[PDB]
Amino acid sequence: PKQYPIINFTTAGATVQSYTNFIRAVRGRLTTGADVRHEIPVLPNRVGLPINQRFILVELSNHAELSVTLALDVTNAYVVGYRAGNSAYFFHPDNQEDAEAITHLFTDVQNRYTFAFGGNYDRLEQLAGNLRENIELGNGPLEEAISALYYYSTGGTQLPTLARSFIICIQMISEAARFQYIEGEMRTRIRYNRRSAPDPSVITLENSWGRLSTAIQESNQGAFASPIQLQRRNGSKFSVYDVSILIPIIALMVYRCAPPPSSQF
């Protein structure tokens, strides 16, 4: 199941508008938007979330007319595994609860596997043999990633290629869902039919999703207890002291704490 909600996207003839429609649809299934803090929606709390509400599926197709279906965890927007035909593969979980939860995905698939690696960027970068800094994003990279995921089960994709493919999907789908800024970066690449690696503004934002989510949620009025350092496109560092500059940048936060009074507005 695969009775979880499914959102479809194809790279074939993809446009700025079709990509925007897709990311907006993904956000809509990740969270109801009923929990908002300082104008920014929060994903559902993992604690107490029923398994029938835990995942959504993204069915990706490309020009080669190959399809794969990614599973995303609504509590963190991240890719946890995928199905291609009669085989499904999952990142290695870190805890029993997550290991148990993924058994509820793709339950009719003939062949199920857990990868001998986790899906966090450190691990995927190590396997890929490159950092996010050197892995190009765009419609072209996504097209290739879909083919690579598709050919993995039959022995046709080596692990470093597979890891690179996951890094591409994760940033173009999960990180784009989490951040309007990164959705915008991907829109620009599609607009100009361009492939290019993410600059430091994107990578530091990705890394900081957790600490930004904590800083915003722990604030009564949106001012941070401690500033958080981000980077500009040219790599220079700056400090963020409150939520205001982040409202146009972050689309969704991971649940970190119950809302202090007034933090809902």
């Epitope: 993992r46 509590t75 963190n76 870190d94 986790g118 960027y121 600490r211």
Partner: nanobody, 117 residues
Framework: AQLQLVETGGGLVQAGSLRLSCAAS????????MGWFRQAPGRERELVAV???????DYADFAKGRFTISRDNAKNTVSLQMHSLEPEDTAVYYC?????????????WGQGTQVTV
Amino acid sequence: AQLQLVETGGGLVQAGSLRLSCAASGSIFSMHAMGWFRQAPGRERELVAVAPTGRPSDYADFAKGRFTISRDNAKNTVSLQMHSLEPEDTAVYYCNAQLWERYVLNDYWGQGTQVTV
């Protein structure tokens, strides 16, 4: 299972060396970075040097040349060798460990060690 950070090597010193060290224990699935920050009374907490996985060490301007960070990825230890210390470097020094957990990067902090110059 809970991450613990144990800091060593603080103390009193005078202008012109001192070495800090931190060892992490507990369930560590993926350590993205280990580093050292510092905070003086009446000032914000600030980065001194950080060693992110797979990348060059990142030093604050004031640490360039003077300080050297050293991370042992296998052992989850990080040390900071400081030379040419000034009174302006007086602060509480904190070890920072950044761990990927459930696909989110979480910060953890040592209890802090006083350095007085």
